[PDB]
């Protein structure tokens, strides 16, 4: 018959079971904050003298015009705004110009799997990507998003294997794939490195990404790859002045779709900013 104490017993079970239900969906609703480890590197060059060295000696700084069909030389003011590292600090998306792309962060495996939901070939090898990002010292978000863009329409067909004689070779980072023929040149490169299995293509490409683009500690972040603040204008990875900003938006949006944020950052401080910094730290830490 009808009872009132049985209701209390079940309202109790309802609160408990609904607590564990919410405790397992909390990953996909609430922002996960990460304590940041920021390396601050003081520089001897001033921002003016670094801008001077970008303006004249190389002068290969390109800009897409309003037509977005041809490249032109960048202005002196356009180069100044693109390389002012102080403006990008309080920016939500552009703070990832300073993300150390060589430090494996260790993001939850289920967060990464939720991003590759529409890429079954990359979702099958999520474990190989994370094992490679940690063994080959590459940021897993950068390693994944690079494999996402380097396995596009015609390039994902290279990620599933190209039949060459009696073997099928895989390439998940589009490496060695020239614009003349992406599938052919990409599969020929994977055949010379013995990438006959997908796992070999994952680790070897992540090994290639670290040894070819993350070699120097002075150029770990997107900013230092583009502007090389320890040697301005020289060993720079791109000519487009928006290159560091365009890649950071790709990185930042990848982090936002996972409801988390980056951890390891490395910011380079020009000489003009390094005067009032060391005095403020000693002031804000010692109190007599």
């Amino acid at each position: 018959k009808g009872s009132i104490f049985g209701i209390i017993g079940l309202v109790v079970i309802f609160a408990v079971v609904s607590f564990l239900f919410f405790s397992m969906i909390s990953d996909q609703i609430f922002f996960k904050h990460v304590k940041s480890d920021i390396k601050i590197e003081k520089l001897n060059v001033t921002l003016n003298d670094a801008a001077k060295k970008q303006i004249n000696n190389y002068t290969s700084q390109q800009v897409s015009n309003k037509k977005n069909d041809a490249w032109r030389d960048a202005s002196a003011t356009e180069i100044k705004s693109a390389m002012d590292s102080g403006t990008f600090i309080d920016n939500e998306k552009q703070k990832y110009q300073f993300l150390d792309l060589s430090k494996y962060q260790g993001i939850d495996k289920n967060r990464i799997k939720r991003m590759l939901v529409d890429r079954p070939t990359l979702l099958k090898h999520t474990d190989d990507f994370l094992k490679a990002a940690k063994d080959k010292h590459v940021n897993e978000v950068y390693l994944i998003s690079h494999a996402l863009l380097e396995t596009g329409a015609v390039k994902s067909e290279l990620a599933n294997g190209v039949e060459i004689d009696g073997k099928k070779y895989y390439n998940f980072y589009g490496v060695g794939a020239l614009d003349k023929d992406p599938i052919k040149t990409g599969a020929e490169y994977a055949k010379k490195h013995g990438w006959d299995t997908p796992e070999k293509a994952i680790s070897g490409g992540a090994d290639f990404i670290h040894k070819h683009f993350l070699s120097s500690t002075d150029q770990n972040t997107l900013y230092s790859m583009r502007w090389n603040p320890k040697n301005p204008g020289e060993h720079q990875y791109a000519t487009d002045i928006k290159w560091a900003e365009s890649n950071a938006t790709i990185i930042a949006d990848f982090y936002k779709n996972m409801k988390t944020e980056g951890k390891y950052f490395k910011y380079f401080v020009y000489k003009d900013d390094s005067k009032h910094l060391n005095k403020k730290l000693a002031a804000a830490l010692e109190h007599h």
Binding site: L10, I13, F14, V17, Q28, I29, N110, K113, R114
Partner: protein
């Protein structure tokens, strides 16, 4: 209570449910909705019950398990109709995190339909199906056998109605196991209710389907996903059936 009226009621309800399930297939754009919100084929057991209630005698027995009244036993059964879906969704989540590739909530999939439209649609789908399968058909079979065997009979007929051979015969086998266990749980969830079974049955049916689509929408068609769901539902079924049997 006549033996002839019992068998014909079982036969009439079943053939017209299956007939309308196919006749309502073409009639998909006559309600102003899409299959995602409300499947028009789910009106087959509803119309079946209404026609059986009229063509047969003893209206008192025809409308026995249609008790629309709030009672303290059904309120108790209502929160049971919430725990048992929640515990099965929990077991499904652990199985997907441990052995598969996790799961994605419905809100983060880029929906072109509001979530309230989906929730309201799953409730109405739960209402019309349970109105004819559990509020009418169940207590009709329960006039000649106990709740256990009556749940087995309604389980076979609901599984044929809810048969899904879209993804192969192996998928249909585990989907059959899921819908059969889906009926054994509700047979006990409405046992000894004094008829007040509509609210219990719709609360469990809606929480189940909406809970599956709100959590495991990216798993539609996967043979492993229907396996863990069928197993998780059967595991909770045998436990709830076994529990209510030893206290009995």
């Amino acid at each position: 209570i006549s033996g002839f009226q019992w068998a014909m009621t079982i036969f009439v309800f079943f053939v017209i449910t299956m007939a309308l399930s196919i006749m309502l297939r073409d009639f998909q754009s006559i309600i102003g909705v899409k299959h995602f919100i409300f499947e028009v084929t789910d009106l087959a057991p509803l119309i079946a019950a209404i026609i059986c209630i009229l063509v047969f005698k003893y209206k008192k027995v025809q409308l026995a398990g249609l008790k629309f009244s709030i009672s303290l036993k059904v309120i108790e059964r209502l929160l049971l109709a919430l725990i048992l879906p929640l515990i099965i969704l929990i077991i499904g989540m652990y199985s997907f995190n441990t052995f598969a590739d996790s799961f994605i909530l419905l809100q983060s999939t880029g929906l072109s339909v509001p979530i309230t439209h989906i929730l309201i649609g799953h409730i109405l789908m739960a209402f019309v199906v349970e109105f004819g399968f559990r509020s009418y058909l169940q207590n009709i079979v329960e006039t000649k056998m106990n709740t256990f065997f009556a749940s087995i009979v309604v389980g076979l007929m609901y599984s044929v109605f809810s048969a899904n051979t879209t993804y192969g015969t192996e998928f249909a086998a585990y989907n059959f196991l899921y819908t059969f266990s889906f009926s054994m749980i509700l047979g006990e969830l409405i046992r000894a209710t004094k008829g007040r079974t509509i609210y219990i049955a719709t609360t469990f049916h809606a929480s189940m389907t909406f809970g599956l689509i709100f959590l495991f929408s990216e798993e539609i068609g996967d043979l492993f996903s229907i396996k863990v769901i069928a197993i998780s539902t059967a595991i909770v079924a045998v436990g709830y059936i076994g529990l209510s049997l030893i206290i009995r």
